[PDB]
Design a binder for this molecule. Structure first.
Ligand SMILES: Nc1ncnc2c1ncn2[C@@H]1O[C@H](COP(=O)(O)OP(=O)(O)O)[C@@H](O)[C@H]1O
Ligand SMILES: [Mg+2]
Lengths: 546, 48, 49, 48, 40, 77, 51
């Protein structure tokens, strides 16, 4: 911090050498330097940010998942928090902003314990006994989500994930959208275990009216253009057959290394004809099957387009692999990589075709989308987001994508807990009485671990531009009486948090904000494992590149 | 598991339009009878 | 009007340091803590020079 | 030609789970019971 | 640092520091370098 | 705090002994480096005037309050 | 098309001289230029003012 140290005094290293508490201080400032951009983005009162790529392009982002991934940091101690933000997005999909703040403060608050001659091995042991004591207390205080006869255990869950976004005001409209979407795309596996594949719904970047008037599609929406303009755009009538092909349908050459050689020039035209005919024989049998709509991964040549225009078939090129599996899964078809069977003959059976009620191509602000609705075998869903531009919709795309992961977890695990820093304030009262029981040096480690957990409710008040100590002192008073509740419900002074729009302490159950308990579990372990990685480092050895 | 060829490069010629029907059928037939022997041996998992 | 550029008038001179935000007073505290670290081990009879 | 059933092993459960993004193929049990078995353990962690 | 030039003493980049055990080894070996001149 | 860290002793055992022993150690209770223990300083004949203490707190309180009333930094040239 | 005429009859005065009329929102900019140092005075009036 003060000055640079001596460069390899009687050590003979090509790179730099540093040791002592100086690098330990640099890791604290390194974790705090990358955490300051995450501070202002926490809670509903947080504001968004924009990252410029020095080419004019910019992107608005609130969550610290992709912000820290875009910020190219060269200090390796900061890379662990960068990967921690990416790690938490994969498993849980929510709380990337919280683990960076929690992990940074645990290292910041533990920095005072370093110069007290408390070893890091004793500090992490005091943190770990506080962790498993906190997990059991979280397992005591949580609650199942069937919860009540009315739903609204899913309408309220969406508000927590939808808060701190541009469309947080429209969360009342989008709360019904996300719950209706994930209940349509469920599946069955492992003999009774229900799964909810995230990203299976199609998020379209449309422009137009507003985010409030975003129409929920009762079915999947394919984002691709029509091949020819002379084709029929709208196909009515029930039992519309869906064909999902992937083989190469355009005219292709012979095998990858063979050479066509012929002596008799009479058959030179005939081999040209059958190469043009062998590709049309495949299109002939699809017309015999009567598939109104056909989808292909590869291209579609003009030799095939004439047959679809004549027979009124909807041929669409330039489909992707991951989409057609969901089309076949929803419409009831099966993925056809090639047309063949166990016998030597080549044919096409009608069982490979799907079924849907209606297919309509719609265009909105230079965005052609094929609206497939009314799947008979299994339902599907897609959300057409509408806003100002593509870069504003990227925040909405991440806002919706994080909302599916949160609503995924509350259905997989019915246990939930209230927001507003309730459990973060409750663990402090639980750990203070436990810190005195253990006696020896781990009291300060467990105590300072509890003090670091209060940063989540404190940051909600700091970013709100209000008085923070009064809200924290009132939240401290109610949680202080929870441990001394004196059971005989009348077990009140629990399940309360901050209300920032009004600045009062009210019941979070009635306010309608909840979060699954599994997000709290994985966030605490991943935050502490990152804290263990930084505390145990003593000396750095940076080797310059050759 | 591939269509029939030695490890070295080869040349296949086509002197008549009817030869292509035999080539496209026999190339998958070499894959078909391998799957029949796999089905006869009831081998459900393969590692290539 | 006398020139095609029309330069925008900056309030302060060129090279003047930054201004209000988050971390201004914290930098002054960290600057004092930095100087305080050098004089830290020199306390008492069992200190150093 | 030398492919037969005597050269193949056996197992009770062969599956591929997707445990929170980390995709892994797992085999459970071996019915051959050879002389010297082998050991396989997967290492999981938050950071690489 | 927080992006701003964090400087305290004049000529910050010129002067260096040394602490811990490495500061002591520079002192004792410097005396041994002079002691070898005087010992012979 | 730092007076004992330079001595090589653990700060937790010292600081826990100071607080709970002020009742019998009314005013002359402090650290002793010779015996590696904590006892009464009146018997050890270690004295110091009070003027260092008054000017230290007044100068330290004036120093911290000076820049605590500052949230700006202007540097011309 | 590639380059403007860059304000003809500009040699009446020196190149360093510049004019700033009321149009083009420049009076709004002068109010904004006052607003830069005026906000510095907000933290410095009163008994709780900061040096
Ligand atoms: N309406 C609300 N009232 C009080 N606290 C809230 C509210 N919405 C969110 N929070 C708090 O914000 C924290 C993180 O919010 P989150 O939705 O993860 O933000 P982000 O989407 O930016 O990651 C939660 O721990 C929760 O307690
Ligand atoms: Mg969230």
């Amino acid at each position: 911090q003060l000055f640079n140290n001596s460069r390899s005094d009687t050590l003979f290293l090509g790179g730099e050498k540093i040791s002592g508490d100086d690098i330990r201080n640099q890791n604290v400032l390194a974790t705090m330097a990358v955490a300051n951009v995450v501070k202002s983005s926490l809670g509903p009162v947080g504001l968004d940010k924009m990252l410029v790529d020095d080419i004019g392009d910019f992107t608005v982002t609130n969550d610290g998942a992709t912000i820290l991934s875009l910020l190219d940091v060269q200090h390796p101690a900061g890379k662990i928090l960068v990967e921690l933000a990416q790690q938490q997005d994969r498993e849980i999909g929510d709380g990337t902003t919280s683990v960076v703040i929690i992990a940074s403060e645990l290292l910041k608050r533990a920095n005072e314990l370093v110069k007290n001659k408390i070893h890091p091995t004793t500090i992490i042991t005091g943190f770990r006994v506080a962790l498993r004591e906190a997990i059991r207390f979280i397992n005591e205080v949580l609650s199942t989500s069937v919860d009540t006869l009315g739903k609204e255990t899913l309408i309220n869950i969406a508000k927590t994930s939808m808060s701190s976004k541009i469309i947080g005001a429209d969360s009342d409209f989008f709360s019904n959208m996300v719950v209706d979407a994930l209940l349509a795309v469920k599946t069955q596996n492992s003999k009774g275990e229900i799964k909810y594949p995230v990203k299976a719904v199609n998020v379209l970047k449309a422009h137009g009216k507003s985010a409030t008037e975003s129409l929920l599609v009762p079915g999947y929406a394919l984002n691709c253009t029509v091949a020819s303009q002379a084709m029929p755009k709208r196909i009515a009538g029930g039992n519309v057959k869906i064909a999902c092909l992937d083989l190469n349908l355009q005219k292709a050459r012979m095998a990858m290394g063979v050479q066509i050689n012929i002596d008799d020039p009479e058959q030179l035209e005939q081999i040209r004809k059958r190469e043009a005919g062998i590709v049309l024989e495949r299109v002939k049998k699809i017309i015999d099957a009567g598939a109104q709509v056909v989808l292909t991964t590869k291209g579609i040549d003009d030799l095939c387009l004439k047959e679809f225009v004549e027979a009124k078939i909807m041929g669409v090129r330039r489909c992707k692999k991951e989409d057609l599996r969901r089309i076949a899964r929803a419409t009831g078809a099966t993925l056809v990589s090639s047309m063949s069977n166990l016998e030597g003959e080549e044919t096409f059976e009608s069982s490979y075709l799907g079924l849907c009620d209606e297919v309509v191509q719609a265009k909105f602000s230079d965005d052609e989308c094929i609206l497939i609705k009314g799947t008979s075998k299994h339902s599907s869903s897609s959300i057409i987001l509408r806003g100002a531009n593509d870069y504003s919709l990227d925040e909405m795309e991440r806002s919706l994508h994080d909302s599916l992961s949160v609503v995924k977890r509350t259905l997989e695990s019915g246990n939930v807990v209230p927001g507003g820093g309730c459990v973060e304030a409750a663990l402090n009262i639980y750990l203070d009485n436990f810190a005195t029981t253990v006696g020896s040096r781990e009291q300060l480690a467990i105590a300072e671990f509890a003090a670091a957990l209060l940063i989540i409710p404190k940051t909600l008040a700091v970013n709100a531009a209000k008085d923070s100590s009064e809200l924290v002192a009132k939240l401290r008073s109610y949680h202080a009486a929870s441990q001394m509740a004196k059971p005989e419900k009348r077990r009140s002074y629990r399940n309360y948090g901050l209300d920032l729009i009004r600045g009062k302490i009210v019941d979070e159950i009635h306010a309608g904000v909840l979060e699954p308990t599994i997000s709290k579990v994985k966030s605490l372990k991943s935050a502490l494992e990152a804290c263990v990685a930084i505390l145990r480092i003593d000396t750095m050895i940076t080797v310059d590149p050759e | 598991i591939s269509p029939p060829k030695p490890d070295t490069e080869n040349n296949i010629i086509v002197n008549d339009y009817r030869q292509m029907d035999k080539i496209l059928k026999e190339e998958r037939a070499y894959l078909l009878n391998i799957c029949k022997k796999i089905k006869k041996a009831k081998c459900n998992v393969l590692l290539i | 009007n006398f020139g095609s550029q029309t330069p925008t008038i900056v309030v302060l001179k060129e090279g003047t340091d930054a201004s209000q935000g988050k971390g201004q007073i914290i930098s002054n505290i960290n600057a004092c803590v930095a100087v305080q670290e050098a004089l830290k081990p020199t306390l008492g009879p069992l200190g150093s020079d | 030609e030398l492919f037969t059933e005597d050269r193949l092993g056996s197992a009770d459960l062969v599956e591929e789970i997707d445990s929170d993004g980390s995709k892994i193929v797992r085999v459970t049990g071996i019915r051959n019971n050879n002389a010297r078995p082998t050991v396989s353990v997967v290492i999981r962690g938050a950071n690489n | 640092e927080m992006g701003r030039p964090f400087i305290i003493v004049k000529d910050q980049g010129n002067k260096k520091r040394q602490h811990g055990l490495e500061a002591k080894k520079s002192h004792i070996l410097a005396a041994r370098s002079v002691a070898s001149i005087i010992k012979t | 705090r730092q007076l004992c860290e330079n001595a090589g002793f653990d700060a937790i055992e010292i600081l826990n002994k100071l607080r709970l022993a002020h009742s019998k150690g009314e005013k002359w209770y402090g650290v002793v480096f010779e015996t590696e223990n904590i006892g009464d300083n009146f018997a050890k004949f270690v004295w110091e005037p009070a003027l260092v203490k008054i000017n230290a707190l007044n100068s330290a309180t004036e120093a911290t309050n000076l820049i605590l009333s500052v949230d700006e930094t202007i540097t011309n040239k | 098309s590639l380059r403007l005429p860059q304000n003809p009859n500009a040699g009446l005065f020196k190149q360093g001289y510049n004019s700033y009329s009321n149009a083009d929102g420049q009076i709004i900019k002068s109010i904004a230029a006052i607003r830069e140092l005026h906000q510095m005075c907000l933290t410095s009036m009163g008994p709780c003012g900061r040096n």
